[PDB]
Design an enzyme around this catalytic site. Structure first.
Site, PDB file in Angstrom:
ATOM      1  N   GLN A   1      84.774 136.977  37.872  1.00 34.66           N
ATOM      2  CA  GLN A   1      83.424 137.309  37.435  1.00 34.66           C
ATOM      3  C   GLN A   1      82.680 138.122  38.498  1.00 34.66           C
ATOM      4  OE1 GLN A   1      80.966 136.041  34.176  1.00 34.66           O
ATOM      5  NE2 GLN A   1      81.774 137.990  34.959  1.00 34.66           N
ATOM      6  N   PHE A   2      82.984 139.409  38.600  1.00 32.02           N
ATOM      7  CA  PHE A   2      82.328 140.248  39.593  1.00 32.02           C
ATOM      8  C   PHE A   2      80.805 140.311  39.427  1.00 32.02           C
ATOM      9  CE2 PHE A   2      82.002 143.317  36.266  1.00 32.02           C
ATOM     10  CZ  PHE A   2      80.992 144.194  36.667  1.00 32.02           C
ATOM     11  N   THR A   3      80.295 139.962  38.246  1.00 33.42           N
ATOM     12  CA  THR A   3      78.850 140.012  37.991  1.00 33.42           C
ATOM     13  C   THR A   3      78.013 138.944  38.689  1.00 33.42           C
ATOM     14  OG1 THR A   3      78.958 138.661  35.971  1.00 33.42           O
ATOM     15  CG2 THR A   3      79.186 141.026  35.712  1.00 33.42           C
TER      16      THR A   3
END
Lengths: 148, 148
Positions: A78-80
């Protein structure tokens, strides 16, 4: 490095309808790698997640960790989690590690945590997924490695 | 005040098996009230959530907000967003607002956001729930009011 961990009763990831990782009672872990991130960030993190007393029985809440209850773990990239919403309507991700290095740190992270001896499923890295989460409680905790 | 918002395709809350709030395509919002929290925190927050371009079409990601796509919103109380895992295996919640004031700020928050004119469901405050989340992407964003 950062993580959003949700106490789940059931949780899985599926790609195009094909489930690629599933767990029953345990933890869903959202992982975000940061520019800067190192092996030590993985350590300082993989640790707090394994000993977090968020599970409960009928006698008291927040007394058992994932290990304690021998729960299952589901890691999902989950790079966000390093989203910057400070300016525009559109979020920024300057702090999010580049994908190549990120996948790297990601795989190492999952490897370190498998050392817990627990059942650890994962999602797919680099592409879109439909993450199914049944948050019991619900119980959600945030943790940064630059803070532990 | 703090929030963990997950882009969902479907998401609902159920108590003892009785669903008490449901939405289709839209946002699941985890809300945590902080000692200190004020009306302005609600503002500074309810705003960024409504204009966040996290929704996408086939031509580009991160270009539409919940309003833009006229999505549904599900607010779920989550005092654990102000969890302190800095010391023991057990998490601390010194910063989490007391329940009474918290419910208060909680209801106001949900009221402010209904002003968006969108369909806004909620969970139950004060007791346990089984939160069902289908995170599309998945897309998860964290936002504090003391940071916006």
């Amino acid at each position: 490095m950062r993580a959003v961990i949700q106490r789940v009763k059931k949780s899985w990831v599926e790609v195009d309808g094909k489930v690629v990782g599933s767990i029953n009672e345990g933890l869903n872990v959202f992982l975000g790698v940061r520019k800067g991130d190192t092996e030590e960030d993985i350590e300082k993190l993989v640790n707090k997640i394994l000993n977090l007393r968020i599970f409960e029985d009928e006698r008291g809440k927040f007394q058992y960790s994932v290990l304690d209850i021998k729960g299952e773990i589901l890691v999902v990239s989950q790079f966000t989690l390093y989203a910057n919403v400070k300016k525009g309507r559109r979020p920024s991700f300057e702090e999010a590690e580049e994908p190549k290095r990120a996948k790297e740190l990601y795989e190492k992270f999952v490897d370190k945590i498998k050392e817990s001896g627990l059942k650890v499923e994962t999602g797919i890295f680099g592409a879109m997924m439909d993450v199914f989460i049944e948050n019991w409680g619900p119980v959600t905790i945030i943790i940064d490695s630059r803070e532990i």
